[PDB]
Paper text:
In all structures, the ligands were found in the active site. Binding of CMP, a fragment of CTP substrate, to the free enzyme active site induces a major conformational change of R755 with a ~4 Å displacement to provide a cation-π stacking interaction with the cytosine group. In case of PfCCT, a flip of the non-conserved Q636 sidechain additionally provides space for the accommodation of the ribose. Notably, its alanine counterpart in RnCCT lacks the ability for this sidechain flip. The nucleotide ligands CMP and CDPCho are anchored in the active site by several polar contacts, hydrogen bonds and a cation-π interaction of R755 with the cytosine ring. The burying of the cytosine part is observed in all available cytidylyltransferase structures complexed with nucleotide ligands and is expected to contribute to the favorable binding enthalpy. Here, we found that in the free and the CMP-bound PfCCT structures, the reliable positioning of the K663 sidechain is precluded due to the weak electron density, suggesting its high flexibility or disorder.
The de novo Kennedy pathway is the main route for the PC synthesis in P. falciparum and has been identified as a pharmacological target for the treatment of malaria. In contrast, the gene of PfCCT underwent a domain duplication event and thus encodes two catalytic and two membrane binding domains connected by a disordered interdomain segment. Here, we present the crystal structures of the catalytic domain of the P. falciparum enzyme (PfCCT) in the free form, as well as in complex with its substrate ChoP or fragments (CMP and choline) and with the product CDPCho, thereby visualizing the free and the ChoP-complexed states of CCT for the first time. The enzyme forms a globular dimer with an α/β Rossmann fold that is well conserved in CCTs and other members of the cytidylyltransferase enzyme family.
Author numbering:
A (entry chain A), B (entry chain A): 616 to 712, 739 to 770
The structure:
Amino acid sequence: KNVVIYADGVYDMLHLGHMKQLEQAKKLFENTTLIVGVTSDNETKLFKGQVVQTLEERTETLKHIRWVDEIISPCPWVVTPEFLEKYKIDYVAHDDIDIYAWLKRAGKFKATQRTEGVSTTDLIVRILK
Amino acid sequence: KNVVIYADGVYDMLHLGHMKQLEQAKKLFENTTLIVGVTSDNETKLFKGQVVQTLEERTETLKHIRWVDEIISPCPWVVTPEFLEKYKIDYVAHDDIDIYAWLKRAGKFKATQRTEGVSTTDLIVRILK
Ligand SMILES: Nc1ccn([C@@H]2O[C@H](COP(=O)(O)O)[C@@H](O)[C@H]2O)c(=O)n1
Ligand SMILES: Nc1ccn([C@@H]2O[C@H](COP(=O)(O)O)[C@@H](O)[C@H]2O)c(=O)n1
């Protein structure tokens, strides 16, 4: 009955968009365990860009989110089949833009939706107006 | 056994300081219900200053916090004895600077600690440096 869901990301300056994504992932099935992977400072710098918050900060905030059952911090930058076996993960949940093609082929990918206009930085834009 | 705790505030741009306060309030006793009061846009404008986020936004974010059992939105600007009776509140939890003197006299005030340097706006200061 219980299904293990994995959602990875940077989760920098956690905002309502992230929280709604985690809620979505958590409620994909009736009984789930949501594991959240948080990306390292270095790989995030190397591949995405600057992070405002450190791994420790990004991880500590996530701990306070209702839908989060377990956190893997740091998590691998790229998901692998071996990683899924190690953590008994049934599905990977993430927005859908292919780096996830192999997960889709395996029937282990659950797409989630982004929430626009709600980021921490969009809120700063308000203040300046 | 179960104890009802009430924590009120603005909770604008929710950050780790708020989340740690709510965790503190929630863990004041072994078995609690944490009710969170969120202040109205008008009274917050009148008495504190501008709020970035609306009541609806401030409330929606709080919903995603693990420690929150119930939300009263909007909540009264000032706590009264009648309000405590209506919601069967045992203790009010808030930082300690006296507007809370009457609660302290009644044995219904539990002080919580602020967390410094961790606000959403302090994180914006980082980016600019
Ligand atoms: N506005 C946003 C921003 C991110 N998200 C989701 O939060 C998760 C982590 O995103 P980041 O790695 O960009 O922090 C991803 O699944 C992403 O789709 C969202 O659903 N809405
Ligand atoms: N840095 C901060 C900011 C607020 N808080 C707490 O969060 C609650 C709500 O604070 P505000 O009304 O300022 O949003 C209060 O109990 C306050 O003490 C905190 O513990 N640390």
